[PDB]
Amino acid sequence: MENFPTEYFLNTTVRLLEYIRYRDSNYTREERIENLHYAYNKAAHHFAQPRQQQLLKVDPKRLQASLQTIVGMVVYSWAKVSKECMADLSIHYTYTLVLDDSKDDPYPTMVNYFDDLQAGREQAHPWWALVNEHFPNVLRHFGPFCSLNLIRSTLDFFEGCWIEQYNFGGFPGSHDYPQFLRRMNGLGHCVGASLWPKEQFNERSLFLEITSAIAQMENWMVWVNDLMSFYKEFDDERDQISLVKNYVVSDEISLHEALEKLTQDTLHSSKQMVAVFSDKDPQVMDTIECFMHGYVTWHLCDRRYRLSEIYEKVKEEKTEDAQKFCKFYEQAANVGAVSPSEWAYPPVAQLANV
């Protein structure tokens, strides 16, 4: 496995896109830009505040980059939620993304977690201090059940980052470890339940569909990301513990086999995703369908994933896949390719300095 399985990749991707029913939609480039800037502007103002500036140890250049990656992700996948919602979620998911920048052992700051929590004293760990303080702005858009899911998944996430600080791919033969870990820092339930604002949905009325959405969406969302970010992560010696890389270490199988395990779960996930929801409430299947499409557009458009390289390579090849891929790609670009100068400004730093 010296070269990238380009062939195999293009195929799986095209399949994924077909299974999910990837296709044109109602978001218009004008609307995308409207939201991108709204969400970005609110967040940027937030992170530019002195208190946030002070407690969130992050290289500005990176905070800037992360915020933009997150706004884009939210605005493109949470298509049916309100602008405020996109903004508030953008702030939350930007906090979670930023946490992977800390080597700082949580232990000492997590020693009085529960006692402080129960007492109502600000957490020792600055991340929690900021996140928990801001949480209400996200939580207000949801009902009690969904809120609990966001709260849990975020706590889960904090631990997942803790575990990852050990750059540990699992003991050989620890088959349960890889997914255990992936699920932990996957924020699956956060994503899954944040898709159902109480302004547009009734938690109690759609409890079974929402729950089922969360349950299924958790895996789809994470595996689609593991697959998409598999091209950028291929020749990157820095990223040592990914789901695929851990399957290799824990299950004791080849990278190809692991990559195989992933695609099968991903494709199967996609199939059942559509199967279960097609005939369900229209408004639900819509949010679901839009999340998947936007989530894939976002992966395809954001440079972070360097997929444009996969495109420029097979750009001409006359294979069904290669052509099926290139078509889909252009699809995304027509609505997903947007210069940051159109929405992401001014820079967070600039707002912070003022």
Added chain:
Amino acid sequence: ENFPTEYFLNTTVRLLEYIRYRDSNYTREERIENLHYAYNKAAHHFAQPRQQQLLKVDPKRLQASLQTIVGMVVYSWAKVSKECMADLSIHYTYTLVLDDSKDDPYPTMVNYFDDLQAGREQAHPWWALVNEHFPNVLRHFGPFCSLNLIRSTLDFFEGCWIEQYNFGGFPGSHDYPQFLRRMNGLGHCVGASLWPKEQFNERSLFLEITSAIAQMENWMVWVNDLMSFYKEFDDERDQISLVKNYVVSDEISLHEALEKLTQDTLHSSKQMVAVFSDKDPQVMDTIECFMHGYVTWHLCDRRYRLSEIYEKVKEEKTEDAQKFCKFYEQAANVGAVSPSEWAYPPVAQLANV
């Protein structure tokens, strides 16, 4: 419907035989010592007026649950201190009192986070009691393990909420069954509560502890799904079970579901030993003891009425009814203990006083 008394025998035999069920840790004297210590502390706790007032539970059931839990803890957390067994017994008794309950959480969970962040007592009486008591359990652990207990308990509360809808998942929702089982499984709570900071160093054994939690989560729940593949059947409140949901969600026969479970269970057991054998001795010990005690407890405890089986095939000359009874015996040798020896006085009696 008809209970797979035949199939039930089958699987049970396979596992018991593979994992090699053999509880030889602990002496009956020691078991009774702990049983009564744990029971006594808990019983005094639940008998308190405040607990008596906020925890809506039929006394007869609270009494039964407490005993089921003390036994579970004392028999599986063999290497933890007496206090630890007790405090854990109180925590897991709170969770059990919930596990078999009815009451929409929604209204009381409406200000969960705001109250939490403010430090105001939760609206839901269960949280009000549990969160108040939590420190007694959490003191026995380090920060990492504590986080795992806190998370898994929160997860559990949601799991019970979901179960109140008696929903086995939409047909074709393959991910739903395990999603749910994991939620109300308390896997991480169990898994991390096995490593008291008095006997272990969270930082020194982080990788082993984490791996233990990761693997133990599934073993623990699947072993219970298999063992209780009897008392949860006909039962109404336990209608939506992992196996029963596999049937509804994966659209397969009860046999296929049951077959799937054993495959996971056996494979889990396999890798459990594989990964840990050559690891720190003290770790493999806690792990090995939990598994054995956890199985001893299942064969012996009432709640799982596996008795109405030793005596329903104590005549059937099959090998499934003679492999089942070969163990069911071997177990009650050290695990069969009359409650009159440890569980007294009754919680109610302590409460009335």
